Amino acid sequence: GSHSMRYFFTSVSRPGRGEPRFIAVGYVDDTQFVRFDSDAASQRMEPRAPWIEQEGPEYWDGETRKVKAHSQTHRVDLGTLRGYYNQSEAGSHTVQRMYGCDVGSDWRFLRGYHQYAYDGKDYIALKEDLRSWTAADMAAQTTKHKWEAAHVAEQLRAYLEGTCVEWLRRYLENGKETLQRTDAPKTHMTHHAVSDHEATLRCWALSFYPAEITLTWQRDGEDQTQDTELVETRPAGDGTFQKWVAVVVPSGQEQRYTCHVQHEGLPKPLTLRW
């Protein structure tokens, strides 16, 4: 199916003393494969997946150089933004940045993105045409004008359309044993008696990859959302994901209800019944 490479960058200022805490992480689809933490001892971009350890020292030297330049840019941005918004030096503030590319099943460029937030709110983002910017307020509008002047969009677009996709393709090849493997959910259903009159059916999906999934309850072959509960998809910790959906039913009527499971790792959607 489709694939994505995304990088997430967070910088948090530490008013009392010192440079901001800076954390950078890279993902291919739902797999983290690199990290950088300014508080860590190495001061290097580090591997977080076996297949990226294939990369030689020139890779790590280049990534490390680049991520440190990111770190310093965010340091400067935090100071700029504090001026733009007339805030004091007494408080901690956050800049967040995310960018990357999506490719379709043909592994060719589908979509690119680059967005930036300050204290948890939209600041500036690249538009889907990769040629213009979305500035959320007047502060961001100054950055927009600056970046239009310096033709940032053109160089960013060269990365997102070109270099980013080339890396993704390379990672997808070297990591094929895991990256190109879909893990279908392992499903089962549990039953819980609340009272002599009411019961809970819980439909489980475990060990699946990628994280994207749909669990729905039907009653007599018709969709049901009332009296249902659906937890957020959660990481298992071994690279796979978990989700469940529950419905409350009258005791004795369990067989009316079916759980439906859609996932890329499944040729056809699954149906479960108690």
Binding site: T73, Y99, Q155, L156, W167
Partner: peptide, 9 residues
């Protein structure tokens, strides 16, 4: 591989 040319705000 991350972007080689980041710009300040």
């Amino acid at each position: 591989g991350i972007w080689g040319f980041v710009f300040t705000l």
